[PDB]
Amino acid sequence: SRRYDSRTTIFSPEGRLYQVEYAMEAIGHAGTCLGILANDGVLLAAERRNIHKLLDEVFFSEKIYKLNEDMACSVAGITSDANVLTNELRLIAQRYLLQYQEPIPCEQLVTALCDIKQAYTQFGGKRPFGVSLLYIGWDKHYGFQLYQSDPSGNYGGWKATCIGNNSAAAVSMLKQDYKEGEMTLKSALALAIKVLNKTMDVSKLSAEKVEIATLTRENGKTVIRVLKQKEVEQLIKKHEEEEAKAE
Amino acid sequence: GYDLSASTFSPDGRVFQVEYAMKAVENSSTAIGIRCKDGVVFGVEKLVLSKLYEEGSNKRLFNVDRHVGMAVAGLLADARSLADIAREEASNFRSNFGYNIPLKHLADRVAMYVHAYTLYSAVRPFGCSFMLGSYSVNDGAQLYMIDPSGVSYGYWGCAIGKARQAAKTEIEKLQMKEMTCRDIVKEVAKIIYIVHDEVKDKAFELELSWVGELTNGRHEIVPKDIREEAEKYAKESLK
Amino acid sequence: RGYSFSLTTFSPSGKLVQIEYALAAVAGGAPSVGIKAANGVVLATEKKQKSILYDERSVHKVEPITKHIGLVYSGMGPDYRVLVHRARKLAQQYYLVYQEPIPTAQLVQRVASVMQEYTQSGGVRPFGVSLLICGWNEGRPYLFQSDPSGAYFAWKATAMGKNYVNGKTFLEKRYNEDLELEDAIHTAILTLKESFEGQMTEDNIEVGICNEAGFRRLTPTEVKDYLAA
Amino acid sequence: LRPGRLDRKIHIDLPNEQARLDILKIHAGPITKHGEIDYEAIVKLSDGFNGADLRNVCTEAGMFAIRADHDFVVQEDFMKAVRKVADSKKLESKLDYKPV
Amino acid sequence: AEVKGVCTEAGMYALRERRVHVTQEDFEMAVAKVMQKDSEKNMSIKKLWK
Amino acid sequence: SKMNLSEEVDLEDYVARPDKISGADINSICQESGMLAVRENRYIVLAKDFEKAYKTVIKKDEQEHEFYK
Amino acid sequence: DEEAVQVKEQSILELGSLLAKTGQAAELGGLLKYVRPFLNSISKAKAARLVRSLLDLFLDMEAATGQEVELCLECIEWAKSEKRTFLRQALEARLVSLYFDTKRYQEALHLGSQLLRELKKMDDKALLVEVQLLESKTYHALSNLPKARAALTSARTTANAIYCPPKLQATLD
Amino acid sequence: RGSSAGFDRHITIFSPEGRLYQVEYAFKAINQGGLTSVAVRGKDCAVIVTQKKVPDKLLDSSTVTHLFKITENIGCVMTGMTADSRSQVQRARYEAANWKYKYGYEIPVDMLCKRIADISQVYTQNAEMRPLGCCMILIGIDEEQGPQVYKCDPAGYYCGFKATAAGVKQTESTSFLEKKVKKKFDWTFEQTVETAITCLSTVLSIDFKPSEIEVGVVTVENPKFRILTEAEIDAHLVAL
């Protein structure tokens, strides 16, 4: 019936997809996400929004997701569309693995998912997925990697990025304080703690309103880890101490 | 905007499209069915739009099975589609359960088929009301009716059409219970003439039918001689 | 044929409005509670029928999924029935494939994923229900919530439905991680009582538990005994 | 509407079957009539009517009786009147409002 | 406005006590009343919205 | 206090009822009770009279169809 | 023997009610010491009902037999062992009331104030107004008029935000 | 409270206040027939009574009805739109037949009501179609549960009842019946047939005749649903 149709897949009078624009407008309110590619690691730093004394601790994380042995991604937007996209990503990785017996390279994967998303915003009459992704991984083609996606289907390799709340501010400092090719994993983590401390203007890093991820190569194989409470709080104490000495 | 589809209720609990369709059925002429001891009798007033049509153009009595008849009023396209559906139901019943369809069951199946057209937006309600009537040694004489809403109810006498109220006030006087089809026929012509309006419409030719003990349970057009005598008696009664 | 276009669409502020209205319906239902004791998990809702003519035993709101995991809701009824059926079917499919009882986290994930589909699919509207699931898997209690948006949350203790904000304040006051099952169910019974509008007769509330022994509803005589205190 | 100003809120709804019979009798009294008049039939064909509608059934009944140029109201004219006034009712919007 | 009302209320309570001075206990009771009526107004507005 | 109000009536029952009622109504219940009393030609008020009064003055809103909750 | 256990618990409840009505305080105490191993044969919830009801029945009368303090201490210790908390709180409140009845003024304060602290940590209101009123009565017994009045006012405030039963309203007034 | 956002009053979607207006209107259509029914649960007998309006003397009174048998043991009243009522009755008969085919024993009342309410829930989720404007009441004997009385509505609510009324006069009848069930037991003998007739007569204020109601009964001694004839109905009518 044409009376109730929404036309979620039709051009506006200036060639801009409105449902897509609103989808990207939803992301600018979910938790902030940060990307930093070091010379010896990659790292995702999003904010833990589910901040209540009556929530339980479950799973190894709350926003970081594994996709292969050598790949992980974090989400900003709707939680449910996030779950749907994560599942499809896992399926893509396993299908490539089954066909070639090699781990799926990273741009292999990111473009497969974005192709699903783009197709979804091209025809069908559905609403688009209101999710923007950040990924991390290693493959024998380009080493440590950091990609990003949007409701449109566009992606991009970023040496450092920010998708989500206060994206402008975070990318502004990331431009001011990024050493292209001159970053260790430790320095990148410290830069993340600083930038996030700015952005999460509500209080300071409580070591509990934050999520951090690291992807490294150890003993010839990838190792993915989510920073515990003690190390995160120690890093924050180091950050405050450094800022105090600086003043 | 509460009356654009049959998939929407009015704020007072009504499906308007069905009400409009049933309104359409009151623009078509009048039909009559009277049940008696022997059987059923249908009589329809067929308006002659132009002088150029044949006799028997757009007959408004059909045969859905060899023992069943069918009178219609409203959109003729809907009437013919529903005639097709009733024929299909009868044939399927005979092929499956091995005997002539009892009329009640046919009325139920046809009505369900009509009612299914009054739930969705993708289709629109039939613009026709119709009356089925058969006769068998076991089940006796029956006469039913199904309206666009899909409600089926048995009747001792009914009139579907434009002048439905006038006929209804007229059919109520027969005492049809204790007569046979042969006199019911003269009555039916009498009514169809009493209700006809000569100021508005130009002229008509009757279509009469019956099914009763006089047919061995076969529905068939009333023979020419009896029809003419009935018409003549009706003419005289309209002094 | 059936509508092939989504009926929940993004707004200029990037909000899926229909989901917000479903949440409004949930917030306008009957109260519900769930706590995670150290040695059990307790659900409890209110079942105040409209007259003396309703059979309290005719239907129940706290329903199990398997021998060891069950759920209750607050919102609309028929939607809760549908979701109970879907949960039981998904549990049985998991058992058939794996020959082991379904873990609660996974059943919640699966039912929620079923809940997302109706936010985006064509010609359908979101469920007007939120559920809480309780299980005892891996010798460990589990309490989850699932909302019309398809999002789930692990809870230590929660209370949803009408006047759920005040209930969450109460439970924030009364949680103690070293709690024991009887005390937990008592605290729950209280929370419902925080706003009830009448006398809590045995036949106006429900409760269900989970422990090693297995998820199992409480019989009314048991309910009266616990309500004794 | 406060119960110190308007103490009683009396509802006066549409007539029921027995009440319909009463009103029909009250209005149909002063007519000059011939033959049996089975008010059950009209009470049965007058669902949803109100006192005015049944008064109009009587008025229309006499109008029909004159239209024929007789000098009485017979039963059949009553049936015609009831069916007519049933036809005109399709215009009125049937619903009721309560004090809430 | 709430903190302006608490002052006048507390003074008037102290006056009922028949004294020249306001007391901390009186202030506590006044602030309790003023904040209770403020929350009552807020919940009344919420109910009106409902 | 100005009634004849036989000792049978237990007002605690009427006050307990979770029903938001304004003071003007609370006077119509007590007035309709005596009204029924006079209708039946008494000068005492029984529990039934009061029950009918309270059911008369406090008509309960249109029960939301119970497929909510 | 579940039916036998139900019969026995019903019999003990009835016998305790009868003895409390007759005032057989020594027999009530012997009965209470008799059901001591009964905890392992009844539900924790119904063990709670039984112990609390029996303690209330015994304490309803004012027969100064002398076992009130020791019986209450044993019951509170049993509650602690059984991790009852809420019942433990009610028992402690009643024990401090008894300590007031038994002309013990200074000592009963510190435990009462500990109750007030533990209970401000939570937010029970009826018990809180009760204990605050008892503390005010104790301060009146010790003649600490200003602190007693302050406690009374605090208890009044706490009672304002909650509907009061008739007994409680009478005691407050 | 009464906001509208888009088509919330045209298709079955939520209103800003979490309300399905189309389901509500459908409930409003149950009264468009102008009829009422009552059901009462006795100790060994369950009864359903209903009006029977012969609008005029041209209908065949034997055909106009609102009692139907789903199985030989389970019988139901239909109230509201007639075509929708027939559709739901057909679906119920098919469902019961399939239950006995698949599971080897006759269908419990409650489970049939559950299946039918689920069907209606699908009707009130998808927006292509509209909810039916009819309500059911079922009655029969359970093996180990005693007499059962159950009803269902357009939204999908299938509560089981001790005494029920459906139709235009739902609230008055429900009030009367609530008071009775308060009195002693809500009727505790096969002369529960008298209580239902009294309730209908009082609510509608009718003073029924033999030919203006139709009853159905199920007894523990005679589980098969039976449709009370005119002679028996007149006997009961005289009894009071």
Side-chain angles (χ1 to χ4, degrees), chain C residues 53 55 81 123 125-127, chain H residues 14 41 117-118 125 156 160 162:
Chain C
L53 304 182
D55 253 20
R81 273 195 344 251
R125 62 153 185 75
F127 295 114
Chain H
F14 290 123
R41 194 174 75 180
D118 304 349
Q125 193 94 319
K162 314 193 321 313

Side-chain angles (χ1 to χ4, degrees), chain B residues 115-128:
Chain B
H115 161 72
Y117 265 100
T118 89
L119 281 85
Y120 321 100
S121 188
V123 305
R124 69 152 174 77
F126 283 100
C128 155

